[PDB]
Design a binder for this molecule. Structure first.
Ligand SMILES: NC(=O)c1ccc[n+]([C@@H]2O[C@H](COP(=O)([O-])OP(=O)(O)OC[C@H]3O[C@@H](n4cnc5c(N)ncnc54)[C@H](OP(=O)(O)O)[C@@H]3O)[C@@H](O)[C@H]2O)c1
Length: 316
């Protein structure tokens, strides 16, 4: 198991990163410091997580302590939906760079394919509860992202929550300058993503698996929802390998040549989640975990099902 994967920009990306969505501002600085101490070299961030300043403080402390050099870190962030207008993309990136206290990002993603009306509200809604769209499209927003690479603000650009038709639109864009490096998508045993992974990997696009533990802290969880960490079938596979259910869920995508970004703010779990290079799931284990697929998404952007660019009407 190589600890990094080669991107189509020539850079290497660590296959394990720390997620930061729902990491409260007062706890994320310690989380990132512990992660870097433990050995994490990849942090997944976003403007919309409202904690990038605190992530920046942690990275800076570790650079000053000389625990790591900047070139050893792989820092990812994402353009929020209210900044898809071509003229707003650079300013949004630079706000992220300022909060993170960085000269550049290793990777900058279009967070969702759906552009929203600009403003301070992250989700500008109509009276029916549906998001108010912006007059934007995927290709124009991509062109603006490419300019960030040209000016050296980011080393790579990619996408998140794009379906294969949306990826294909970018790959076929007239005058394309940079292919997406990464498509970051929800992926775990209940949403195995076989067709989209096959597609992306066939095009040389690296897939990052988000919510690998099933996002048990998501604010909208309902009692009827299935729970990966509580699934006795996955607990049994963990028992067999003398590992935790979380460790099995992290190793699973690694063996599919995916990058994976489990989130924690608990120091003990941050350390536990990194101890996944000392075992291997069997061929049968992988087939078994894949068989648990039930097309179940924790992250379905339900306020946007009538948006022109809603990604999840398509099969994949
Ligand atoms: N591109 C996108 O649209 C998108 C969408 C969703 C997520 N993401 C990214 O992917 C990351 C991961 O997804 P996620 O945050 O939804 O959820 P996740 O990583 O699947 O699960 C996080 C939850 O699991 C708990 N946990 C972590 N390690 C554990 C362990 N070893 N044992 C027991 N519980 C454990 C955490 O608790 P504590 O933190 O309290 O320890 C938290 O409640 C995000 O943080 C974000 O960076 C991106």
């Amino acid at each position: 198991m190589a600890s990094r994967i080669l991107l189509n920009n020539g850079a290497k990306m660590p296959i394990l990163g720390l997620g930061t969505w729902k990491s409260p501002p007062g706890q994320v600085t310690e989380a990132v410091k512990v992660a870097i101490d433990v050995g994490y070299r990849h942090i997944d961030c976003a403007h919309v997580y409202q904690n990038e300043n605190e992530v920046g403080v942690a990275i800076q402390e570790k650079l000053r302590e000389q625990v790591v050099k900047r070139e050893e870190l792989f820092i990812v962030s994402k353009l929020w939906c209210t900044y898809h207008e071509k003229g707003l993309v650079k300013g949004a990136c630079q706000k992220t760079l300022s909060d993170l206290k960085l000269d550049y990002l290793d990777l900058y993603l279009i967070h969702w394919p759906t552009g929203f009306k600009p403003g301070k509200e992250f989700f500008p809604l109509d009276e029916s509860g549906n998001v108010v769209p912006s007059d934007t499209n995927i290709l124009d927003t991509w062109a603006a992202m490419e300019e960030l690479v040209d000016e050296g603000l980011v080393k790579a650009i990619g996408i998140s929550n794009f379906n294969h038709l949306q990826v294909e639109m970018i790959l076929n864009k007239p005058g394309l300058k940079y292919k997406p490096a990464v498509n970051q998508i929800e992926c775990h045993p209940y949403l195995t993503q076989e067709k989209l992974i096959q597609y992306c990997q066939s095009k040389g696009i690296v897939v990052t698996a988000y919510s690998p533990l099933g996002s048990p802290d998501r604010p909208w969880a309902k009692p009827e929802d299935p729970s990966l960490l509580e699934d006795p079938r996955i607990k049994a596979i963990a028992a067999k390998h003398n590992k935790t259910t979380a460790q099995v869920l992290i190793r699973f995508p690694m063996q599919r040549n995916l990058v994976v970004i489990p989130k924690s703010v608990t120091p003990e779990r941050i350390a536990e989640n990194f101890k996944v290079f000392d075992f291997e799931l069997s061929s049968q284990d992988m087939t078994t975990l894949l068989s648990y697929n039930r097309n179940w998404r924790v992250s379905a952007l339900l306020s946007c099902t009538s948006h022109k660019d809603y990604p999840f009407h398509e099969e994949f």
